[PDB]
Amino acid sequence: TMLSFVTTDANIDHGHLQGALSAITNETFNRITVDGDTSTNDMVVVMASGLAENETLTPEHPDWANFYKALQLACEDLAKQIARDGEGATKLIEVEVTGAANDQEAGMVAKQIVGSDLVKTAIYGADANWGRIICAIGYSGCEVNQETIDIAIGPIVTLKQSEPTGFSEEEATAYLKEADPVKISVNLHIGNGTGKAWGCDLTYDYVRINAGY
Amino acid sequence: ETANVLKLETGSVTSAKGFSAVGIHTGVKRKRKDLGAIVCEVPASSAAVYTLNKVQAAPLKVTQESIAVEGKLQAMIVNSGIANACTGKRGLDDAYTMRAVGAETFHIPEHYVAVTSTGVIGEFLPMDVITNGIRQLKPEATIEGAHAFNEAILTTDTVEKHTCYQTIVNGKTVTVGGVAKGSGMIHPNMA
């Protein structure tokens, strides 16, 4: 189970606050996964005191984007910290998908990758296994052309237009051992859709914690 | 857009004007704090999202009912160790009781009190322990208060999880602070 409690001194009514939270949730908390088990108790509550004494915030307010960004960054930061503290994790994994049919599909593809047990274990082993990543792209349910996919792990492009690049495996492994977060980038070359998802590696300690060892 | 947004690394939920927090150890957990509250000195506009799992813990409903009255809260009370999930009518009664005892403790309307739980599924709350604990809660507008609250919501977590960002609205400093928990059974699907 995750919980998050967010407080602000912004003056804002409950309707506009709710609209912001609902939108932000879809790009932050709903884009993380540790083990794929959706809990019976997950909840986020935001409370706004109004004690900053600004003029009440709505999307028409000239400084709306300031408030919105602060709230979004706060939720993103907390979501990333949850993912990083996945049971047994040694690494946060960030997946960014570009070139999807739309932003929703980019998000679904990104999450499918970070939720794959084969991807999660490869990262634990410091294995730059683009094969496992592309397999997850393929079963995501999204619009995919299998011949036009680029995959990078950190700054190392491992697959370009669905052809392996002959990258240094020693270099890729070195990156995976030191990076936090580990960043995977995917371009599907379908449209303009972009999205991120976050997760963690799958380690022996996940099993120890959850099997009562 | 019209002003930068800056991260405050030592901030938390108590960094926003109006808010106090606390966590205490009631004994449901062996060592860590296991009951906490955040409170606001004025009625605060409130928003929430909730798991779409069709098996849902009682307090989520209770919190929704509070927020539905005026869209405002003054207290958020949380226990950890026991989820109050799959506890049926008795569990729902227990969540209403937590809300009522919280309202008494903080001298505010029941509908300004939200409640939740996290931890073991199917176990009933030890209500003498929880209710006595709620009455002892003394929120403070301090970073230590925020950290004690965050400890009080953890389950399997190895660390607390804090955030704080500040920006400017109408020339006023606006602060957004937060805490979170979660380590296992994590795949949120909330609305």
Side-chain angles (χ1 to χ4, degrees), chain A residues 1-54 56-68 70-159 161-169 171-213, chain B residues 1-29 32-88 90-191:
Chain A
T1 297
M2 62 150 288
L3 302 172
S4 187
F5 306 99
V6 175
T7 63
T8 179
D9 45 27
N11 185 29
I12 184 174
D13 70 9
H14 67 89
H16 292 100
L17 187 63
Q18 183 68 60
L21 175 61
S22 293
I24 290 168
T25 292
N26 288 343
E27 57 201 359
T28 57
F29 301 113
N30 285 350
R31 289 287 181 78
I32 71 178
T33 183
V34 170
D35 51 14
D37 288 288
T38 303
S39 90
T40 59
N41 282 63
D42 295 341
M43 194 194 337
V44 177
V45 177
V46 186
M47 294 171 67
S49 71
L51 294 173
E53 308 301 341
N54 60 280
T56 195
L57 283 148
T58 74
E60 292 67 52
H61 191 296
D63 308 326
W64 175 252
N66 297 356
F67 172 71
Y68 193 94
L71 184 56
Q72 185 187 59
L73 288 174
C75 292
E76 185 176 329
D77 184 24
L78 295 174
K80 287 160 77 177
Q81 293 183 64
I82 292 158
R84 178 58 185 88
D85 205 22
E87 284 171 334
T90 67
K91 298 294 189 182
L92 176 65
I93 306 169
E94 179 175 290
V95 182
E96 184 159 25
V97 175
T98 61
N102 55 48
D103 288 352
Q104 181 178 44
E105 295 201 5
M108 291 163 58
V109 176
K111 204 164 63 178
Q112 200 81 74
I113 296 161
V114 276
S116 159
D117 278 348
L118 287 172
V119 174
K120 290 160 62 58
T121 51
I123 296 318
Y124 182 46
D127 176 18
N129 199 312
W130 60 260
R132 291 172 179 197
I133 292 161
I134 203 177
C135 173
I137 293 169
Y139 66 76
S140 73
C142 296
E143 187 177 354
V144 168
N145 182 328
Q146 72 172 313
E147 302 306 334
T148 71
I149 296 166
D150 306 334
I151 298 169
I153 290 165
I156 302 165
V157 180
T158 63
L159 192 77
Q161 290 296 303
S162 300
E163 300 187 323
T165 57
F167 69 95
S168 166
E169 308 231 64
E171 191 166 308
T173 291
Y175 168 81
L176 290 174
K177 290 181 175 170
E178 306 304 303
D180 213 347
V182 167
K183 303 184 163 185
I184 298 168
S185 302
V186 175
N187 195 336
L188 299 179
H189 293 280
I190 296 293
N192 297 334
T194 61
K196 287 179 181 154
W198 298 271
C200 64
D201 56 340
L202 173 50
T203 72
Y204 295 117
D205 278 346
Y206 183 86
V207 178
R208 170 191 66 85
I209 290 163
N210 287 306
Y213 279 63
Chain B
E1 187 98 74
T2 62
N4 45 240
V5 179
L6 302 181
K7 196 174 198 302
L8 277 57
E9 291 288 8
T10 55
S12 191
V13 283
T14 48
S15 304
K17 293 181 161 83
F19 295 88
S20 299
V22 62
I24 62 170
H25 174 56
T26 62
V28 176
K29 295 180 190 176
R32 275 175 175 180
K33 291 169 168 68
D34 57 23
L35 180 71
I38 291 168
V39 303
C40 189
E41 64 179 309
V42 298
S45 298
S46 301
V49 293
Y50 309 88
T51 189
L52 290 169
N53 191 317
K54 298 197 182 68
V55 177
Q56 247 212 1
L60 276 63
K61 180 182 185 195
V62 176
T63 288
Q64 295 164 11
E65 292 178 359
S66 290
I67 297 175
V69 183
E70 296 189 75
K72 287 184 184 319
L73 297 171
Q74 282 191 264
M76 173 75 248
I77 298 168
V78 187
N79 72 283
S80 59
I82 297 172
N84 196 20
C86 306
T87 44
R90 176 167 164 193
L92 186 57
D93 293 344
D94 288 343
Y96 285 124
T97 299
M98 289 181 59
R99 178 175 77 169
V101 171
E104 287 167 0
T105 299
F106 298 128
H107 192 70
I108 47 180
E110 283 178 17
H111 75 268
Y112 285 2
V113 180
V115 295
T116 203
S117 299
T118 178
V120 178
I121 295 169
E123 187 178 353
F124 293 111
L125 293 166
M127 286 298 293
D128 288 354
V129 171
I130 298 289
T131 59
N132 288 355
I134 291 168
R135 300 195 189 276
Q136 313 312 312
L137 294 173
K138 297 296 190 300
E140 298 181 67
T142 64
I143 190 63
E144 292 89 347
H147 282 241
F149 178 78
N150 198 170
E151 183 175 296
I153 71 166
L154 306 181
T155 58
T156 49
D157 307 66
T158 68
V159 296
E160 296 184 10
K161 305 167 178 60
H162 297 270
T163 196
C164 184
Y165 287 85
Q166 292 196 323
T167 197
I168 310 289
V169 184
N170 298 118
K172 307 292 178 187
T173 299
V174 170
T175 301
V176 180
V179 296
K181 67 84 59 171
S183 178
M185 197 182 268
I186 304 293
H187 187 84
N189 185 27
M190 297 178 299

PDB file of all heavy atoms in Angstrom, chain B residues 160-182:
ATOM      1  N   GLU B 160      11.578   7.171   5.503  1.00  0.00           N
ATOM      2  CA  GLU B 160      10.574   8.209   5.327  1.00  0.00           C
ATOM      3  C   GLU B 160      10.683   8.831   3.936  1.00  0.00           C
ATOM      4  O   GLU B 160      11.673   8.637   3.216  1.00  0.00           O
ATOM      5  CB  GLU B 160      10.713   9.258   6.436  1.00  0.00           C
ATOM      6  CG  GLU B 160      10.438   8.660   7.822  1.00  0.00           C
ATOM      7  CD  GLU B 160      10.457   9.660   8.957  1.00  0.00           C
ATOM      8  OE1 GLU B 160      10.491  10.880   8.712  1.00  0.00           O
ATOM      9  OE2 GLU B 160      10.457   9.204  10.116  1.00  0.00           O
ATOM     10  N   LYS B 161       9.630   9.537   3.531  1.00  0.00           N
ATOM     11  CA  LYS B 161       9.560  10.068   2.191  1.00  0.00           C
ATOM     12  C   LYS B 161       8.886  11.440   2.290  1.00  0.00           C
ATOM     13  O   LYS B 161       7.672  11.535   2.462  1.00  0.00           O
ATOM     14  CB  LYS B 161       8.786   9.100   1.283  1.00  0.00           C
ATOM     15  CG  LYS B 161       9.335   7.642   1.260  1.00  0.00           C
ATOM     16  CD  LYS B 161       8.370   6.675   0.602  1.00  0.00           C
ATOM     17  CE  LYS B 161       8.961   5.279   0.546  1.00  0.00           C
ATOM     18  NZ  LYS B 161       9.283   4.720   1.877  1.00  0.00           N
ATOM     19  N   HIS B 162       9.694  12.485   2.188  1.00  0.00           N
ATOM     20  CA  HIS B 162       9.276  13.879   2.356  1.00  0.00           C
ATOM     21  C   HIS B 162       9.480  14.659   1.084  1.00  0.00           C
ATOM     22  O   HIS B 162      10.380  14.358   0.295  1.00  0.00           O
ATOM     23  CB  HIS B 162      10.100  14.554   3.475  1.00  0.00           C
ATOM     24  CG  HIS B 162       9.900  13.934   4.825  1.00  0.00           C
ATOM     25  ND1 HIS B 162       8.923  14.362   5.700  1.00  0.00           N
ATOM     26  CD2 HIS B 162      10.556  12.925   5.453  1.00  0.00           C
ATOM     27  CE1 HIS B 162       8.976  13.630   6.800  1.00  0.00           C
ATOM     28  NE2 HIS B 162       9.935  12.730   6.666  1.00  0.00           N
ATOM     29  N   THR B 163       8.698  15.717   0.915  1.00  0.00           N
ATOM     30  CA  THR B 163       8.931  16.634  -0.186  1.00  0.00           C
ATOM     31  C   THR B 163       8.488  18.006   0.218  1.00  0.00           C
ATOM     32  O   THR B 163       7.665  18.160   1.131  1.00  0.00           O
ATOM     33  CB  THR B 163       8.194  16.177  -1.512  1.00  0.00           C
ATOM     34  OG1 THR B 163       8.735  16.884  -2.621  1.00  0.00           O
ATOM     35  CG2 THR B 163       6.695  16.429  -1.459  1.00  0.00           C
ATOM     36  N   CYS B 164       9.030  19.013  -0.452  1.00  0.00           N
ATOM     37  CA  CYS B 164       8.576  20.379  -0.254  1.00  0.00           C
ATOM     38  C   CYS B 164       9.034  21.255  -1.409  1.00  0.00           C
ATOM     39  O   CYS B 164      10.219  21.272  -1.751  1.00  0.00           O
ATOM     40  CB  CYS B 164       9.114  20.934   1.061  1.00  0.00           C
ATOM     41  SG  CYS B 164       8.542  22.584   1.507  1.00  0.00           S
ATOM     42  N   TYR B 165       8.088  21.957  -2.023  1.00  0.00           N
ATOM     43  CA  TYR B 165       8.385  22.924  -3.079  1.00  0.00           C
ATOM     44  C   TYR B 165       7.718  24.247  -2.731  1.00  0.00           C
ATOM     45  O   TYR B 165       6.684  24.263  -2.056  1.00  0.00           O
ATOM     46  CB  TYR B 165       7.915  22.419  -4.441  1.00  0.00           C
ATOM     47  CG  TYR B 165       8.756  21.303  -5.026  1.00  0.00           C
ATOM     48  CD1 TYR B 165       8.520  19.995  -4.678  1.00  0.00           C
ATOM     49  CD2 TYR B 165       9.767  21.566  -5.939  1.00  0.00           C
ATOM     50  CE1 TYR B 165       9.268  18.974  -5.188  1.00  0.00           C
ATOM     51  CE2 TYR B 165      10.535  20.534  -6.466  1.00  0.00           C
ATOM     52  CZ  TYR B 165      10.268  19.238  -6.077  1.00  0.00           C
ATOM     53  OH  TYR B 165      10.978  18.167  -6.584  1.00  0.00           O
ATOM     54  N   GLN B 166       8.335  25.354  -3.154  1.00  0.00           N
ATOM     55  CA  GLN B 166       7.801  26.690  -2.933  1.00  0.00           C
ATOM     56  C   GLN B 166       7.775  27.461  -4.225  1.00  0.00           C
ATOM     57  O   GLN B 166       8.636  27.296  -5.088  1.00  0.00           O
ATOM     58  CB  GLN B 166       8.642  27.499  -1.951  1.00  0.00           C
ATOM     59  CG  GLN B 166       8.624  27.035  -0.548  1.00  0.00           C
ATOM     60  CD  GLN B 166       9.147  28.090   0.410  1.00  0.00           C
ATOM     61  OE1 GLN B 166      10.094  28.830   0.098  1.00  0.00           O
ATOM     62  NE2 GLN B 166       8.544  28.160   1.587  1.00  0.00           N
ATOM     63  N   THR B 167       6.807  28.355  -4.322  1.00  0.00           N
ATOM     64  CA  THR B 167       6.663  29.227  -5.479  1.00  0.00           C
ATOM     65  C   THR B 167       5.989  30.525  -5.028  1.00  0.00           C
ATOM     66  O   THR B 167       5.814  30.762  -3.821  1.00  0.00           O
ATOM     67  CB  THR B 167       5.903  28.474  -6.624  1.00  0.00           C
ATOM     68  OG1 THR B 167       6.086  29.151  -7.870  1.00  0.00           O
ATOM     69  CG2 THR B 167       4.414  28.291  -6.316  1.00  0.00           C
ATOM     70  N   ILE B 168       5.657  31.374  -5.990  1.00  0.00           N
ATOM     71  CA  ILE B 168       5.044  32.659  -5.713  1.00  0.00           C
ATOM     72  C   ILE B 168       3.695  32.726  -6.418  1.00  0.00           C
ATOM     73  O   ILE B 168       3.585  32.408  -7.603  1.00  0.00           O
ATOM     74  CB  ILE B 168       5.919  33.837  -6.227  1.00  0.00           C
ATOM     75  CG1 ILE B 168       7.378  33.706  -5.773  1.00  0.00           C
ATOM     76  CG2 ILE B 168       5.365  35.176  -5.739  1.00  0.00           C
ATOM     77  CD1 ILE B 168       7.582  33.960  -4.284  1.00  0.00           C
ATOM     78  N   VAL B 169       2.672  33.144  -5.680  1.00  0.00           N
ATOM     79  CA  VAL B 169       1.356  33.397  -6.248  1.00  0.00           C
ATOM     80  C   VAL B 169       0.881  34.750  -5.720  1.00  0.00           C
ATOM     81  O   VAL B 169       0.835  34.953  -4.512  1.00  0.00           O
ATOM     82  CB  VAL B 169       0.365  32.280  -5.858  1.00  0.00           C
ATOM     83  CG1 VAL B 169      -0.986  32.486  -6.518  1.00  0.00           C
ATOM     84  CG2 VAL B 169       0.931  30.925  -6.241  1.00  0.00           C
ATOM     85  N   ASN B 170       0.553  35.667  -6.635  1.00  0.00           N
ATOM     86  CA  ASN B 170       0.169  37.043  -6.288  1.00  0.00           C
ATOM     87  C   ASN B 170       1.188  37.690  -5.355  1.00  0.00           C
ATOM     88  O   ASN B 170       0.824  38.396  -4.417  1.00  0.00           O
ATOM     89  CB  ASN B 170      -1.213  37.081  -5.627  1.00  0.00           C
ATOM     90  CG  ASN B 170      -2.311  36.585  -6.538  1.00  0.00           C
ATOM     91  OD1 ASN B 170      -2.964  35.597  -6.234  1.00  0.00           O
ATOM     92  ND2 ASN B 170      -2.534  37.281  -7.650  1.00  0.00           N
ATOM     93  N   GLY B 171       2.465  37.411  -5.597  1.00  0.00           N
ATOM     94  CA  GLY B 171       3.539  37.943  -4.764  1.00  0.00           C
ATOM     95  C   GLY B 171       3.667  37.295  -3.395  1.00  0.00           C
ATOM     96  O   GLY B 171       4.500  37.722  -2.605  1.00  0.00           O
ATOM     97  N   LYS B 172       2.840  36.287  -3.099  1.00  0.00           N
ATOM     98  CA  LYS B 172       2.860  35.590  -1.810  1.00  0.00           C
ATOM     99  C   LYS B 172       3.659  34.281  -1.966  1.00  0.00           C
ATOM    100  O   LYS B 172       3.547  33.609  -2.989  1.00  0.00           O
ATOM    101  CB  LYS B 172       1.441  35.214  -1.370  1.00  0.00           C
ATOM    102  CG  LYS B 172       0.399  36.353  -1.349  1.00  0.00           C
ATOM    103  CD  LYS B 172       0.710  37.363  -0.279  1.00  0.00           C
ATOM    104  CE  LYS B 172      -0.306  38.497  -0.304  1.00  0.00           C
ATOM    105  NZ  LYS B 172       0.097  39.575   0.644  1.00  0.00           N
ATOM    106  N   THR B 173       4.434  33.919  -0.949  1.00  0.00           N
ATOM    107  CA  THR B 173       5.136  32.648  -0.962  1.00  0.00           C
ATOM    108  C   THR B 173       4.153  31.530  -0.665  1.00  0.00           C
ATOM    109  O   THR B 173       3.509  31.507   0.401  1.00  0.00           O
ATOM    110  CB  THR B 173       6.277  32.613   0.038  1.00  0.00           C
ATOM    111  OG1 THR B 173       7.217  33.628  -0.302  1.00  0.00           O
ATOM    112  CG2 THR B 173       6.974  31.259   0.020  1.00  0.00           C
ATOM    113  N   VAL B 174       4.024  30.626  -1.628  1.00  0.00           N
ATOM    114  CA  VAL B 174       3.152  29.453  -1.517  1.00  0.00           C
ATOM    115  C   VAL B 174       4.020  28.209  -1.392  1.00  0.00           C
ATOM    116  O   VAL B 174       4.974  28.019  -2.151  1.00  0.00           O
ATOM    117  CB  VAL B 174       2.198  29.329  -2.727  1.00  0.00           C
ATOM    118  CG1 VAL B 174       1.485  28.001  -2.713  1.00  0.00           C
ATOM    119  CG2 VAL B 174       1.189  30.484  -2.738  1.00  0.00           C
ATOM    120  N   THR B 175       3.719  27.388  -0.397  1.00  0.00           N
ATOM    121  CA  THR B 175       4.493  26.181  -0.111  1.00  0.00           C
ATOM    122  C   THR B 175       3.612  24.943  -0.271  1.00  0.00           C
ATOM    123  O   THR B 175       2.434  24.939   0.123  1.00  0.00           O
ATOM    124  CB  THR B 175       5.073  26.255   1.307  1.00  0.00           C
ATOM    125  OG1 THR B 175       5.908  27.415   1.421  1.00  0.00           O
ATOM    126  CG2 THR B 175       5.909  25.024   1.639  1.00  0.00           C
ATOM    127  N   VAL B 176       4.163  23.918  -0.912  1.00  0.00           N
ATOM    128  CA  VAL B 176       3.535  22.612  -1.016  1.00  0.00           C
ATOM    129  C   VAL B 176       4.482  21.616  -0.338  1.00  0.00           C
ATOM    130  O   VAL B 176       5.616  21.420  -0.787  1.00  0.00           O
ATOM    131  CB  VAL B 176       3.307  22.198  -2.487  1.00  0.00           C
ATOM    132  CG1 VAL B 176       2.648  20.840  -2.577  1.00  0.00           C
ATOM    133  CG2 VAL B 176       2.449  23.225  -3.215  1.00  0.00           C
ATOM    134  N   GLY B 177       4.026  20.985   0.731  1.00  0.00           N
ATOM    135  CA  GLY B 177       4.814  19.954   1.390  1.00  0.00           C
ATOM    136  C   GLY B 177       4.110  18.629   1.367  1.00  0.00           C
ATOM    137  O   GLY B 177       2.884  18.575   1.189  1.00  0.00           O
ATOM    138  N   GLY B 178       4.853  17.552   1.576  1.00  0.00           N
ATOM    139  CA  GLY B 178       4.224  16.247   1.568  1.00  0.00           C
ATOM    140  C   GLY B 178       5.027  15.152   2.212  1.00  0.00           C
ATOM    141  O   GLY B 178       6.253  15.255   2.344  1.00  0.00           O
ATOM    142  N   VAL B 179       4.303  14.094   2.588  1.00  0.00           N
ATOM    143  CA  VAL B 179       4.877  12.840   3.033  1.00  0.00           C
ATOM    144  C   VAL B 179       4.211  11.686   2.309  1.00  0.00           C
ATOM    145  O   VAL B 179       3.079  11.809   1.822  1.00  0.00           O
ATOM    146  CB  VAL B 179       4.722  12.608   4.550  1.00  0.00           C
ATOM    147  CG1 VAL B 179       5.488  13.651   5.335  1.00  0.00           C
ATOM    148  CG2 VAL B 179       3.243  12.548   4.994  1.00  0.00           C
ATOM    149  N   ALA B 180       4.915  10.570   2.255  1.00  0.00           N
ATOM    150  CA  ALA B 180       4.378   9.357   1.677  1.00  0.00           C
ATOM    151  C   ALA B 180       4.927   8.115   2.357  1.00  0.00           C
ATOM    152  O   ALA B 180       5.914   8.151   3.094  1.00  0.00           O
ATOM    153  CB  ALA B 180       4.703   9.311   0.198  1.00  0.00           C
ATOM    154  N   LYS B 181       4.250   7.001   2.078  1.00  0.00           N
ATOM    155  CA  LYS B 181       4.737   5.690   2.413  1.00  0.00           C
ATOM    156  C   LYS B 181       4.380   4.733   1.302  1.00  0.00           C
ATOM    157  O   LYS B 181       3.491   5.013   0.469  1.00  0.00           O
ATOM    158  CB  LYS B 181       4.197   5.197   3.753  1.00  0.00           C
ATOM    159  CG  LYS B 181       2.710   4.934   3.802  1.00  0.00           C
ATOM    160  CD  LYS B 181       2.255   3.559   3.295  1.00  0.00           C
ATOM    161  CE  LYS B 181       2.857   2.378   4.022  1.00  0.00           C
ATOM    162  NZ  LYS B 181       2.178   1.123   3.573  1.00  0.00           N
ATOM    163  N   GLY B 182       5.135   3.628   1.270  1.00  0.00           N
ATOM    164  CA  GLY B 182       4.838   2.504   0.378  1.00  0.00           C
ATOM    165  C   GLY B 182       6.125   1.819  -0.041  1.00  0.00           C
ATOM    166  O   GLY B 182       7.114   2.482  -0.370  1.00  0.00           O
TER     167      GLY B 182
END
